[PDB]
């Protein structure tokens, strides 16, 4: 696995932008909500048409939506990012709509992008635009600062952190990378920003073997799927479910489930009994 | 600015070109400049040659400065002045002795050995040539292993050999068999050896015809052995001189044993 | 991939223009909204016909619309750009309409284009005009300033940024291009504007290989499609879904889905369990 | 069993983050609860739209939810974690929704993550997001402090604690690890944080045999499954259930159950009689 596949550079982050806007050009599948009409009236005032107070627009092709964009790291003004458009009123469908000018604000309350474009919906009330938002401002980055760069593991593990440190040391030389915890690995990097990009290009393509990790059993209590990871061991026991008795991975337990009618989701309750009896060498996680 | 010849981390590669018990050759291609070759050879003494081989030959003899420059990705570390060499005209740069081992050591620490000099082909301007340490460790381990598995004798040490026979029998002594095994190892690993001269001859104890018969039987046994190593029959030469041409005083027990001997002389095509 | 295919020049941007207008000539598929009638009355006053106050026009062939145009970089007065016309009232169809004179305003509130023309609609409430807007004003550009030009990658990556820098250096010479982050590459350029255009013409056609990028799994939660990118690796595990057990890309998991009835969209929930168990070497992205 | 499979490092803990948010883009399966409308109005005020007091939004595509995330140990800012989204009002379904910006608070009342993204629901009122929460703050750790590290057994046992101590001592040397109770094992570790990570990497992969543990019988009173562990012994007795008599693991008792009609869950009551008569060498646990 390449380092870039299983890790991210510290300080090189994404940012989330959110804004309110109106979607027009709907085939009569718009809203009549008070906030939609209020926003529509304000927008019309912005163009020189001001209705008398208390006038009902009777609009049916306009829907109020919430626009969200994720700003990739090193985003420069003039670039385009995707936006997700979701209806917040009572519009039946956003299919075929057009997002009007909406300003996307950061967590500090400043506008960083402007979103327009045509919605592509499949849920008819959520659509996407491939280049809806144009980046208008930059977010500063700590990437070029300091005397080292840091890799953050996507899956935290002490062994994976140490193996990535060894991979860099073998490639470059001794005392070059060090694991500071189960997630972060610090690599000494050049001070020049151009040399650091060239340096990081060679390092992020290094190959190493991530560790297997702790043995876990993942149970989706609402879907019924049971994922048993590697290194999970079930201690032998006599399991009596329904009217039949079986002796002890899931293959034997699934057969015991199939013996009686019961249900494939009855296996989720057999594991909990095994966990209480100490017959599982691992972690039973319910998601 | 200046011309710096170094392999970027994406370009740096080290290779073990010759890996035999007679030679070791670790090669680092310096892009746009040439090669850096470390060579060790089978010998009784510690030997390493470093050759900076250039595509465009050295224009003039120049004083060269060897420094141990830290790589860019090592801020806060200073450069160590290693030494001052001389690169000669129309010859590859050569560093030998302890300095070549020191270059290997500075590469082991993760540093860049840098040769700086004024290039004749470059309007007599100062240029730098650096050896990258990227992808050096594994090939340095392989190089150290091959150096470990080097013969402890050279062609000069075995080219002339004199072996002795036992008092009774057609077999060589223990030490003579050990030396013959050394010769066989060197021959089997060296393809440049062309000629083998064998001159068996014995003591005066037996009759002249008997001496000649013993000497010729011994010569033929040695010729068959040398054939077993893979040399073609047109290369081996064997002659039995019997009890003639004594090198020691026949009559003394030690002298007769001295004369009961074979001469083996190798000849190479380097 | 050419540089112009995978990158954009910094400072060479598009601008978005928006305006309000009326669409006439509709076969009785117009509006009766108060703002449509108000705008219609103002337009008629602009031609010398002023109805007495409180007069209802009873118009049925006029619809109020929002007009949007994108101004390409280096747009000069006299050029024509496309406009998207979307209905904002309650008109049933804009098919066969004609957009009347509408002024398109920039983000600074100034008029930069005027839009007219004939609508081409397929959604019957959104139409397009191929040369609707005529550019009337220029937007200044920083392209000719400075001693360098900058390329912004469409897909940000450290390796792609460095490879594009090497491509320029190999073509021209040493110390010519430098990657300053994962997105931008700076190339030294001539000071003369004519020479910079000639210089940029040769550079933008250079070929190089963009990097593969980080391994990702993209899941469209509303369509059901799962796109597994290159370099994604799934660690072996025992997955029990429904009543059958399978052992471990998607091909094996799709067969496990097909074993039981379930649904092709049940695979989206199997991946989440694998992500929780650490059996995915990559990023699971939900769009 | 590896040490990392059956134990956890003391001081290396997870943290739970909880927050309130709204889910938009629902196909008319939203709420009308007073708190949903109040939160929606406050959110709209945050964007510049303030409805007059007493105005009913009449929203149908918005649902109020509770967002929960678990913060893994050594979580750094910029990383992404899963979030579970559960409806707390009266929404019929959260399928196809989009979670709006919600702040996730720790047990001390501070915000440590921000959650957005697209919901993936199978129960239609609970959904998951694979990278919903972005970590914004760090929680300090006692991992690098002291002169030792401590392993906490997932299944507490004196013999397992001592065997893990012997495993470390055999690998490293005498007087290196010591069991302080049935759960914890203390291993002397380097003072340098980088060396401790390298040290812990070698130690957590050590193999040893966990002890069998106390003999137990686990009975799920609501599912009917009976899990009899190893080392459980039933003393011989004459059991008369229904009309037939049997003599004495579960196999004989299951046959006695099958003799009469009765039910497979009647075995749970036979064990309680055996427990009262002292015919069980173990613990009868009801879960």
mmCIF file of N, CA and C in Angstrom, chain D residues 42-82:
data_model
loop_
_atom_site.group_PDB
_atom_site.id
_atom_site.type_symbol
_atom_site.label_atom_id
_atom_site.label_comp_id
_atom_site.label_asym_id
_atom_site.label_seq_id
_atom_site.Cartn_x
_atom_site.Cartn_y
_atom_site.Cartn_z
ATOM 1 N N UNK D 42 -34.090 29.282 13.606
ATOM 2 C CA UNK D 42 -32.798 29.811 14.045
ATOM 3 C C UNK D 42 -31.737 29.658 12.959
ATOM 4 N N UNK D 43 -31.715 28.505 12.288
ATOM 5 C CA UNK D 43 -30.767 28.297 11.200
ATOM 6 C C UNK D 43 -30.999 29.286 10.067
ATOM 7 N N UNK D 44 -32.263 29.560 9.741
ATOM 8 C CA UNK D 44 -32.555 30.530 8.690
ATOM 9 C C UNK D 44 -32.146 31.937 9.103
ATOM 10 N N UNK D 45 -32.307 32.275 10.383
ATOM 11 C CA UNK D 45 -31.816 33.562 10.866
ATOM 12 C C UNK D 45 -30.310 33.660 10.707
ATOM 13 N N UNK D 46 -29.612 32.534 10.854
ATOM 14 C CA UNK D 46 -28.162 32.543 10.674
ATOM 15 C C UNK D 46 -27.745 32.858 9.242
ATOM 16 N N UNK D 47 -28.669 32.814 8.282
ATOM 17 C CA UNK D 47 -28.358 33.108 6.888
ATOM 18 C C UNK D 47 -28.990 34.396 6.384
ATOM 19 N N UNK D 48 -29.686 35.141 7.235
ATOM 20 C CA UNK D 48 -30.266 36.408 6.848
ATOM 21 C C UNK D 48 -31.749 36.394 6.560
ATOM 22 N N UNK D 49 -32.420 35.257 6.712
ATOM 23 C CA UNK D 49 -33.865 35.162 6.535
ATOM 24 C C UNK D 49 -34.491 34.996 7.910
ATOM 25 N N UNK D 50 -35.246 35.998 8.347
ATOM 26 C CA UNK D 50 -35.906 35.962 9.647
ATOM 27 C C UNK D 50 -37.405 36.114 9.438
ATOM 28 N N UNK D 51 -38.146 35.043 9.694
ATOM 29 C CA UNK D 51 -39.588 35.080 9.546
ATOM 30 C C UNK D 51 -40.217 35.867 10.694
ATOM 31 N N UNK D 52 -41.369 36.493 10.460
ATOM 32 C CA UNK D 52 -42.062 37.163 11.552
ATOM 33 C C UNK D 52 -42.464 36.164 12.618
ATOM 34 N N UNK D 53 -42.564 36.600 13.873
ATOM 35 C CA UNK D 53 -42.897 35.664 14.952
ATOM 36 C C UNK D 53 -44.242 34.992 14.720
ATOM 37 N N UNK D 54 -44.319 33.718 15.093
ATOM 38 C CA UNK D 54 -45.537 32.957 14.917
ATOM 39 C C UNK D 54 -45.758 32.410 13.528
ATOM 40 N N UNK D 55 -44.768 32.501 12.646
ATOM 41 C CA UNK D 55 -44.909 31.993 11.290
ATOM 42 C C UNK D 55 -44.599 30.503 11.258
ATOM 43 N N UNK D 56 -45.502 29.728 10.666
ATOM 44 C CA UNK D 56 -45.322 28.288 10.559
ATOM 45 C C UNK D 56 -44.567 27.969 9.277
ATOM 46 N N UNK D 57 -43.365 27.391 9.353
ATOM 47 C CA UNK D 57 -42.592 27.140 8.127
ATOM 48 C C UNK D 57 -43.261 26.186 7.157
ATOM 49 N N UNK D 58 -44.067 25.245 7.655
ATOM 50 C CA UNK D 58 -44.679 24.202 6.829
ATOM 51 C C UNK D 58 -43.624 23.393 6.080
ATOM 52 N N UNK D 59 -42.535 23.068 6.763
ATOM 53 C CA UNK D 59 -41.460 22.290 6.161
ATOM 54 C C UNK D 59 -41.823 20.815 6.193
ATOM 55 N N UNK D 60 -41.505 20.109 5.111
ATOM 56 C CA UNK D 60 -41.733 18.678 5.032
ATOM 57 C C UNK D 60 -40.507 17.885 4.616
ATOM 58 N N UNK D 61 -39.388 18.536 4.310
ATOM 59 C CA UNK D 61 -38.178 17.846 3.888
ATOM 60 C C UNK D 61 -37.057 17.964 4.914
ATOM 61 N N UNK D 62 -37.371 18.381 6.139
ATOM 62 C CA UNK D 62 -36.379 18.596 7.186
ATOM 63 C C UNK D 62 -36.778 17.776 8.404
ATOM 64 N N UNK D 63 -35.804 17.095 9.010
ATOM 65 C CA UNK D 63 -36.025 16.302 10.210
ATOM 66 C C UNK D 63 -34.935 16.588 11.231
ATOM 67 N N UNK D 64 -35.333 16.725 12.492
ATOM 68 C CA UNK D 64 -34.382 16.918 13.579
ATOM 69 C C UNK D 64 -33.824 15.581 14.034
ATOM 70 N N UNK D 65 -32.502 15.526 14.202
ATOM 71 C CA UNK D 65 -31.795 14.285 14.479
ATOM 72 C C UNK D 65 -30.777 14.514 15.587
ATOM 73 N N UNK D 66 -30.299 13.412 16.155
ATOM 74 C CA UNK D 66 -29.193 13.412 17.102
ATOM 75 C C UNK D 66 -27.998 12.724 16.461
ATOM 76 N N UNK D 67 -26.855 13.404 16.458
ATOM 77 C CA UNK D 67 -25.650 12.933 15.787
ATOM 78 C C UNK D 67 -24.651 12.499 16.847
ATOM 79 N N UNK D 68 -24.101 11.301 16.684
ATOM 80 C CA UNK D 68 -23.143 10.742 17.627
ATOM 81 C C UNK D 68 -21.919 10.258 16.870
ATOM 82 N N UNK D 69 -20.738 10.592 17.377
ATOM 83 C CA UNK D 69 -19.486 10.107 16.822
ATOM 84 C C UNK D 69 -18.582 9.634 17.948
ATOM 85 N N UNK D 70 -17.758 8.635 17.646
ATOM 86 C CA UNK D 70 -16.755 8.130 18.570
ATOM 87 C C UNK D 70 -15.390 8.579 18.084
ATOM 88 N N UNK D 71 -14.651 9.270 18.947
ATOM 89 C CA UNK D 71 -13.364 9.832 18.570
ATOM 90 C C UNK D 71 -12.272 8.824 18.898
ATOM 91 N N UNK D 72 -11.610 8.232 17.909
ATOM 92 C CA UNK D 72 -10.580 7.235 18.192
ATOM 93 C C UNK D 72 -9.396 7.864 18.899
ATOM 94 N N UNK D 73 -8.605 7.073 19.619
ATOM 95 C CA UNK D 73 -7.421 7.628 20.277
ATOM 96 C C UNK D 73 -6.408 8.139 19.267
ATOM 97 N N UNK D 74 -5.647 9.148 19.689
ATOM 98 C CA UNK D 74 -4.672 9.826 18.837
ATOM 99 C C UNK D 74 -5.333 10.462 17.621
ATOM 100 N N UNK D 75 -6.568 10.929 17.774
ATOM 101 C CA UNK D 75 -7.247 11.604 16.678
ATOM 102 C C UNK D 75 -6.702 13.014 16.521
ATOM 103 N N UNK D 76 -6.289 13.346 15.308
ATOM 104 C CA UNK D 76 -5.682 14.618 14.984
ATOM 105 C C UNK D 76 -6.655 15.487 14.198
ATOM 106 N N UNK D 77 -6.529 16.811 14.282
ATOM 107 C CA UNK D 77 -7.391 17.683 13.480
ATOM 108 C C UNK D 77 -7.221 17.417 11.994
ATOM 109 N N UNK D 78 -8.344 17.409 11.282
ATOM 110 C CA UNK D 78 -8.367 17.128 9.868
ATOM 111 C C UNK D 78 -8.788 15.719 9.513
ATOM 112 N N UNK D 79 -8.807 14.807 10.481
ATOM 113 C CA UNK D 79 -9.238 13.446 10.223
ATOM 114 C C UNK D 79 -10.760 13.364 10.210
ATOM 115 N N UNK D 80 -11.270 12.264 9.665
ATOM 116 C CA UNK D 80 -12.702 12.054 9.517
ATOM 117 C C UNK D 80 -13.115 10.773 10.225
ATOM 118 N N UNK D 81 -14.259 10.819 10.905
ATOM 119 C CA UNK D 81 -14.784 9.670 11.623
ATOM 120 C C UNK D 81 -16.242 9.469 11.231
ATOM 121 N N UNK D 82 -16.737 8.259 11.475
ATOM 122 C CA UNK D 82 -18.129 7.939 11.198
ATOM 123 C C UNK D 82 -19.049 8.632 12.194
#
